[PDB]
Amino acid sequence: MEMQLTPFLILLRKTLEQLQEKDTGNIFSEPVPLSEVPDYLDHIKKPMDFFTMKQNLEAYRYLNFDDFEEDFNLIVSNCLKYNAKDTIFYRAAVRLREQGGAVLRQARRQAEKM
Numbered sequence: 874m875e876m877q878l879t880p881f882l883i884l885l886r887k888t889l890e891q892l893q894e895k896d897t898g899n900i901f902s903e904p905v906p907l908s909e910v911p912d913y914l915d916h917i918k919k920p921m922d923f924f925t926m927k928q929n930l931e932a933y934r935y936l937n938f939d940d941f942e943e944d945f946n947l948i949v950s951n952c953l954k955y956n957a958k959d960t961i962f963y964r965a966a967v968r969l970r971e972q973g974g975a976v977l978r979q980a981r982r983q984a985e986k987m
């Protein structure tokens with residue numbers, strides 16, 4: 874149940890903070906702004922960002938590690954999909970994939986101890 878999951882959610886909260894710290898350009902920490910990118914949903918079926926992941930975490934939407942990891946991976950893959958390779962966005966998503974992936978590998982090991 875939800876109370877039994879408390880330590881797991883504590884682990885996710887810490888992991889999310891570590892992931893969000895990898896957003897050195899501050900471009901993955903709010904939804905892509907549809908006022909400035911009005912075609913974004915034409916292209917991307919499930920937007921994701923670190924603020925939305927925090928909201929999801931606090932709303933009990935992540936009950937296992939895979940579901941959490943899936944949403945992080947969308948932050949990356951949506952950005953690679955929407956943007957051309959020779960963009961600040963694409964390069965930033967590659968950096969995030971690498972650095973965030975290291976965070977997740979360590980965090981998954983700690984989750985396995987639970």
Ligand SMILES: COc1ccccc1C(=O)Nc1cc2c(cc1N1CCCC1)n(C)c(=O)n2C
Binds near residue numbers: 899909
């Ligand atoms: C606040 O963002 C903007 C303000 C003025 C003009 C343009 C933008 C803008 O394009 N923001 C933006 C585009 C993104 C994007 C993120 C942004 N924002 C998010 C907050 C600052 C930049 N990602 C991850 C993308 O893949 N795209 C295409």
